[PDB]
Design a protein around this ligand. Sequence first.
Ligand SMILES: Nc1ncnc2c1ncn2[C@H]1C[C@H](O)[C@@H](COP(=O)(O)O)O1
Ligand SMILES: Nc1ncnc2c1ncn2[C@H]1C[C@H](O)[C@@H](COP(=O)(O)O)O1
Ligand SMILES: Nc1ncnc2c1ncn2[C@H]1C[C@H](O)[C@@H](COP(=O)(O)O)O1
Lengths: 30, 520, 520, 184, 122
Amino acid sequence: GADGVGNSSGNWHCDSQWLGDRVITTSTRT
Amino acid sequence: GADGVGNSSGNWHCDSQWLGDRVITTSTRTWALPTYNNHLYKQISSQSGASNDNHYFGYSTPWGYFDFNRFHCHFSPRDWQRLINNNWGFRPKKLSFKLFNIQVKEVTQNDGTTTIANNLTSTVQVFTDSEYQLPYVLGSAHQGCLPPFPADVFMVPQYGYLTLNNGSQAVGRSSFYCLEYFPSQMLRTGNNFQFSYTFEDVPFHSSYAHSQSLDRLMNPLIDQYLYYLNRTQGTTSGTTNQSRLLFSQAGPQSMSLQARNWLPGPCYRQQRLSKTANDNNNSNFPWTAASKYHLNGRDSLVNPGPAMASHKDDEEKFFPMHGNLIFGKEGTTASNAELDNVMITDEEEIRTTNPVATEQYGTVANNLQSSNTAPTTRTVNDQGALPGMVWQDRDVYLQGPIWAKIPHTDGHFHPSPLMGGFGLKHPPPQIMIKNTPVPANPPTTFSPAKFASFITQYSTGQVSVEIEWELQKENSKRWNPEIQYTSNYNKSVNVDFTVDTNGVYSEPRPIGTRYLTRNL
Amino acid sequence: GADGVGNSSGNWHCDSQWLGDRVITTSTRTWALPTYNNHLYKQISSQSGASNDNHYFGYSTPWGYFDFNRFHCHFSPRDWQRLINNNWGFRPKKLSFKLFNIQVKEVTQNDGTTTIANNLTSTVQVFTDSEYQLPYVLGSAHQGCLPPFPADVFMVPQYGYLTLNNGSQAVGRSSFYCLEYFPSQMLRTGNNFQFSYTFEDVPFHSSYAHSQSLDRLMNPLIDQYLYYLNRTQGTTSGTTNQSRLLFSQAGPQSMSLQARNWLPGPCYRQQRLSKTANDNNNSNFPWTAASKYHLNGRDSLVNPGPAMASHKDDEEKFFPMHGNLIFGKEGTTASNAELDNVMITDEEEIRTTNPVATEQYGTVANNLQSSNTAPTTRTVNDQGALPGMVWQDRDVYLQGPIWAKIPHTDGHFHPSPLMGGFGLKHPPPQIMIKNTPVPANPPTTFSPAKFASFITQYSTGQVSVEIEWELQKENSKRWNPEIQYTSNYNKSVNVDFTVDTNGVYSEPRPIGTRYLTRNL
Amino acid sequence: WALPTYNNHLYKQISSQSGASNDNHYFGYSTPWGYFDFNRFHCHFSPRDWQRLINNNWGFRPKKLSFKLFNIQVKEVTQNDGTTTIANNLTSTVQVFTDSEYQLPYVLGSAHQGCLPPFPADVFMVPQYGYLTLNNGSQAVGRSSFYCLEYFPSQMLRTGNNFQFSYTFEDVPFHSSYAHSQSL
Amino acid sequence: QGPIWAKIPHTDGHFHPSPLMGGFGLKHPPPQIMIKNTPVPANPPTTFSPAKFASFITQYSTGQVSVEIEWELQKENSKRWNPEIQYTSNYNKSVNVDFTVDTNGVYSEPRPIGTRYLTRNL
Ligand SMILES: Nc1ncnc2c1ncn2[C@H]1C[C@H](O)[C@@H](COP(=O)(O)O)O1
Ligand SMILES: Nc1ncnc2c1ncn2[C@H]1C[C@H](O)[C@@H](COP(=O)(O)O)O1
Ligand SMILES: Nc1ncnc2c1ncn2[C@H]1C[C@H](O)[C@@H](COP(=O)(O)O)O1
């Protein structure tokens, strides 16, 4: 990825939901 | 390439992998560049009566330059080991030069505090002397190369050149060069510089040492069918036996008398020195007794002369007066350092093809012997070239020079860099660099006077050099093991080729290249 | 090829015919091979304190080898005549090696009678060093070549090689070679061996001699337009005539003073010897007064040095101290033979391009002459190479060496075999041969001990070598007849180049190659 | 290689000496057969090769195999008076076979001698085959096994005959031609 | 000069089936190759004998043998900066040459040779 100065290079993804068969854990920290 | 402010114009490429047939060395370092000569070209020259053999005339340029004419710039200690211990020979092939991540910081001394900030709108200028129109100042063992250790930062050297001179003065045929009269690419932050070069055909280096000798080349078991004269008088000496011409058939017994097909390499005798500071003469002779040449009535020391052996067997203490390259250990003043502070290189692998540097060359006749005259012998101290001579060149060490620009003259003999390496007609061109001058504050009234008030600023960024190396694999039917370079497995203080307690990389010893054996 | 017991695996091909443009020499001889070193590799070395310049270290191998590095191996006396008297020059082109009609005889000493019989189920082993991994021991004037006379039988020599050594001892960089670690073809009776080789590009030999001279190259009738200085003082000497600078225009009169474009070949002075055992000094100086070189602190005699002329005009009795190849007559001990038992070769055709071996080289200045100082002259005894020098190489004789393996070093000058012939990077590889060891009777109980009880046996058979030769025809506008080699038509005792009363071939004299004249 | 006639063309029952040792008791047989072995690295690698190998590779392993017997000669000896004469018995044969079904006791991999000489120029004597079986002291049990190598199909060779054999190693982990720079 | 392989015994269980003396543990290792001289009856009697034959002509066999083995290699991939230790011959002035025949033709292996000279991490 390649962008600029006043443009965030990512979002705050921190969440977890279940699939009954599996689970996805998303974590974001500073 | 063209991008923006908050976008890196390059990545950190520093690695090396092998192809068995060849090896690619990628190296990246961080560099810093000041403003040299205050944005000015200056005429430099020899001090008014300060020295005679050191007279000179030239100029100092506001430009800096990049250099990596050292093997340790590209190979790591380990890689160099693999290379040395496995290959008959090797050579340079391709080249990739890259400049990126440029930042121009301008500094201001306000009160008693130096503040440094970003001057984004400022540029830097690069160009490569590919037409070879600027004096080639590389291949002279100068400093300012790329750091052996990748983590180290370096300062970009300044460009200065010499010209024809008559003492402290110059001749009308001298030449003044302005690097501003060269088209150069100017770069802002986010701009990068690209360059690709292709090495010419140049003979592999000798990463080998001969297991045979010049005089020990024949068959130990069979006798020659040729005859030589070995007795001029000594007969059945008793009665009436003055003299008689007697010839012998060469045998394994007459080993140093047999007919020969080849001669040793040329020579230029060097003075013998001992490392023991008491074997030597109690006199200062590093100039009045050393071998030197002179041009235009100017003495110059013949430092790395023709390739000659350092010492004969069973000595290993007598080195030639500057008969080899000497490297200075890390942290050691440039002025009169101790013997235990330098690393002297031993050229004892070329004993079989080359004459000993300090020893003589041989015997020559110089009279018409007869009943009236006794035969005379002359000790030859200097030998030009001869039909039938065969020699091995010097050696390259992990920290030695790589290439050298063969001078553009009417004639050359065996154009191999005396300091060692690859002699190139057209070597990796010079890459120049300089901070674009920024005028400080100008007056509201017009001034014809030369501008000399500039904003103080320095540049910084990364540089990347990729080189491909062709390899010559080893094909020997030697039964017993050959000698290999290795680290001392013993319990040790510091680790060879490593940083210390306060972060300083240090190269313990010089590294030869000749560990593998090939015949004659 | 693969056939049976009662079927010859080859024919006797020995003949030579001419193509006017080239000549093919076919040669076949009968060979015999013993069991060398008792099926063992032995470490050989110099005697514990027997000699100093003759120290050595190497090994003795159970293998034999084939050699034909002598011209008389291929050319007959007559052919050599045609060749010499007709061609400007010549060279090697192709090669065909063939082994056949092999028979393995095993011998047993029963009581007081040696019985010899056939061991059909026994084999012999051949292989050719084409990768040049075994020390090249050929081109050293060794004996064991093919017999000059076709009817003669020869013994196949033994292979022995030398290595790097430190006196009587060896270095860790020395090399041990086992010829068993080479893939070899094993042959039973009815098997044969085949091999084809192709010579590289190598300059024709000089089967000619110059009719002009270096200094006698200009025009006898016209004067030069160049000027030289010939008078420094001698003026109209009488009144007030101390000195004056006077120049003359070169004329046919000032023949040895005219401007020159070229120089003679290099030189390395040799001592002058007389064939008359009374002209000489009453002292034994064949080592203490002879020209020699030294490597690694080891003296070696410079036998066939640079190509220099043997004697000046009107002498023909003074030969250089080993300044040429000397051949031994048939039937003459290897230890101190008489002067009337050897054949010394005269190099008196190269007088026009080469300096005299025993004589000096010339005059050199070595001071700044003036009113205060008298001009000084130095007799030059040793001259390296120089821009503008031109020389002729040595000569090849009917019984001289043919080729020589140019050593694999970093550098060579004028890589022509000092003993004469064709210098080859890749010369006709070495062909090895040895009788496959046959275990004698073994014990019913197992023994880990090295086996050393073998059946005694020797091999025999024929060998064939075919060589093609490219020729350089003669194109001269010489009006008068040139000199030709010829036999003495006079009533004679024995016939030149022939067997005697009890069957022994003998080569009367050495045969030069330079009988035809070409200009400069 | 050289091969004698072992056990005088006879299979012999061997066993422990009647009360000579206790932890060394044994029972087996001695066969008239010899065998080939090269279960030593120096049989294949030269000193130099071994160096290249060692100094360059993380690890290594065996893959394929090619066995060949040739140039066979059968010499018969006769002691006439006080002189041993040796000659050629062309019409005589030799017998080879390979235990590929692994039915004969595997006697290799026991550090025995008789391998191929480290040095190529050296000649060696072909060892003799002998095997052991279940034993109760100096005696044997009923469950012991007697093997006759003659009950195996074997190829007989005259002079000019040769023997051929190809084998393929199974999957076996590389050897550690390395040493750890870290510790546990 | 060490062993190469070893036949893993055919039992109900093994743990870490590596030859204790070192090398490659093989379920099915290079089979055994047998050799023997075919018995040749000496001179027989004109009268028939049921007795076991034990009079043979004394004879021995000889010839060549060839063994070709292919070896898979695992190359070295280390980012070690400083040099590693290597096996080498003593470059010093020496008596006899390591791994060589002597004055009367006897090959001799000076020292044992390890295999572990290169370093890898954990
Ligand atoms: N480093 C290097 N570069 C180029 N040539 C080398 C070098 N070292 C040795 N030589 C030799 C190889 C050629 O035979 C010869 C050409 O010389 P010339 O004067 O060009 O005819 O110079
Ligand atoms: N016998 C023989 N073989 C090869 N070359 C010869 C010989 N005799 C003379 N020369 C000359 C011919 C080439 O001009 C030169 C090449 O030298 P180089 O050092 O190869 O550049 O050497
Ligand atoms: N030389 C040798 N041969 C085979 N396996 C080896 C060897 N050395 C170590 N191992 C290990 C590798 C497998 O993970 C394990 C299988 O054991 P198992 O009992 O087979 O389940 O044994």
